[PDB]
UniProtKB/Swiss-Prot annotation, chain A:
Domain PDZ: 11-91
UniProt-recorded name of the protein: Na(+)/H(+) exchange regulatory cofactor NHE-RF1
Location in the cell: Cytoplasm; Apical cell membrane; Endomembrane system; Cell projection, Filopodium
Sites bearing Phosphoserine, chain numbering: S43
SUBUNIT field: Homodimer, and heterodimer with NHERF2. Binds the N-termini of EZR, RDX and MSN. Binds the C-termini of PDGFRA, PDGFRB, ADRB2, NOS2 and CFTR. Binds ARHGAP17, EPI64, RACK1, OPRK1, GNAQ, CTNNB1 and PLCB3. Binds PDZK1. Interacts with CLCN3. Binds the C-terminus of PAG1. In resting T-cells, part of a PAG1-NHERF1-MSN complex which is disrupted upon TCR activation. Forms a complex with CFTR and SLC4A7. Forms a complex with SLC4A7 and ATP6V1B1. Interacts with TRPC4 (via the PDZ-binding domain). Directly interacts with HTR4.
């Protein structure tokens, strides 16, 4: 059939809620392999479009895969109010990696939509 | 036990 343009890592700006953002991130004890384990239904994370099955690739625009599990979490915690979490479905990542285009922000920063917040 | 943010 026809497949759409699968190359759209979603940038989720997570707001500092009560004492964090409201998700549980699980990481494999190496470097690359940080995935969301569980999301709090009462978090700013879930409304940002962050799902309990996504992988975190970049924080605010810079890649955090080659960090440590601690450092990855620290990246998000280092944000006072808002932090831009770039997340993608691990299933979709398989397709995306094969494209390897500048989807990092070049694609993400498409046309502007003035109106809603 | 995962990591809470």
């Amino acid at each position: 059939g026809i497949d759409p343009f699968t190359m759209l890592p979603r940038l989720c700006c997570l707001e500092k809620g009560p004492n964090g953002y409201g998700f549980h991130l699980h990481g494999e004890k190496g470097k690359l392999g940080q995935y969301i384990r569980l999301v709090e239904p009462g978090s700013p994370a879930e409304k940002a479009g962050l799902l309990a099955g996504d992988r975190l690739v970049e924080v605010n625009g810079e890649n955090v895969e080659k960090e440590t599990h601690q450092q990855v979490v620290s990246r998000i915690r280092a944000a006072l109010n808002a932090v831009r979490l770039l997340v993608v479905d691990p299933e979709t990542d398989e397709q995306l990696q094969k494209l390897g285009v500048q989807v990092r922000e070049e694609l993400l920063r498409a046309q502007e939509a003035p109106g809603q917040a | 036990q995962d990591t809470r943010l």
